[PDB]
């Protein structure tokens, strides 16, 4: 999977085809983190082929639809349980992200895992994302934003829009 742009969160359900052995197979639901529904269905078949004895030709996806954030305006703390593949072995993580939505937090998770550990999106496997109150947070980079009277300046405003005034007289001010 290519983590293209931002991720989306799909509630994908599926089951096996009806057989003369069992008439109605049970339904299996997952929360797939994917850009679009085609790769959501593909990654759903990947995880179902990992977990159960079920493949695409021996089964079916009953419904694949995007399910949205119930509070996109509130800023929350998502704890994501990671299972990634290193260059030497496979490892597990538990990493916190302060963000609005689940899809945005998982997008930031893919970007930051590829940042620090060079972990590719085909190696990264997400198993659980849970919204967490501010008391149960563990990471100090997330807990440092937990303040009612938070107050900080913007210390070094490195200016952009550099190549429209290419040849100017005055030196740029950067104290704001």
């Amino acid at each position: 999977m290519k983590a293209s742009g931002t991720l989306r969160e799909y509630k994908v359900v599926g089951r096996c085809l009806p057989t003369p052995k069992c008439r109605t197979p049970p339904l299996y639901r997952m929360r797939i983190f994917a850009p679009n529904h085609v790769v959501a269905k593909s990654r759903f078949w990947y995880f179902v082929s990992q977990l159960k004895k079920m493949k695409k030709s021996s089964g079916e996806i009953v419904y694949c639809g995007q399910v949205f954030e119930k509070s996109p305006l509130r800023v929350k703390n998502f704890g994501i349980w990671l299972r990634y593949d290193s260059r030497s072995g496979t490892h597990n993580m538990y990493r916190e992200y302060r963000d609005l939505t689940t899809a945005g937090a998982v997008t930031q998770c893919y970007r930051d895992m590829g940042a620090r550990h060079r972990a590719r999106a085909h190696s990264i496997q997400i198993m659980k994302v849970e919204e967490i109150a501010a008391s149960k947070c563990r990471r100090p980079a997330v807990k440092q934003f937990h303040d009612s009277k938070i107050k900080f300046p913007l210390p070094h405003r490195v200016l952009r829009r550099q190549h429209k005034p290419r040849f100017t007289t005055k030196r740029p001010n950067t104290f704001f």
Partner: protein
Amino acid sequence: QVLVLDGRGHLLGRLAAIVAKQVLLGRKVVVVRCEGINISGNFYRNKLKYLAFLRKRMNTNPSRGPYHFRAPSRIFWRTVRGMLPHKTKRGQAALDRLKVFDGIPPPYDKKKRMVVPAALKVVRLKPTRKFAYLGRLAHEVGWKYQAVTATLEEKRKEKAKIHYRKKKQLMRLRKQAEKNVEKKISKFTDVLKTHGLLV
């Protein structure tokens, strides 16, 4: 029609890439006070880079070899000539259009010089990163005219301080004349305020 560019606080290659394109595009660029050019990274890496550059010479005849220039203006000419197709006639015309000075001469001291913010040290580098002065690097590697340029620039900074004092006195005269005469020129003043020039 001449880009008189300042050299203080400007990055070497980031300035040279901006200069060489405008030189190829038919603009007379004069980059001045090139000992104020500062190169990113600490001083010892840039010094050993230029010392490896000095060691790279022709074995059988170094007079035919690479001419390693020691002046900061000629180091800037070296990097712009590296950023030009100087084997071609348009590159030779570009090198003819380019004119680079150590210090700042009396043909160019009494001119308002330009500053490129896309190649400046405080813009493009983090403040915790180290930088190396090209003039100090050149005088340490064998350029003989740092103190002479320092005394001549001290003299012209005194002269430019006197000129800027005269300009401040003229600006005070202009503002006090406007404060006196604003009643009878309020008809000319209000029409620029409705068009957005003095608001």
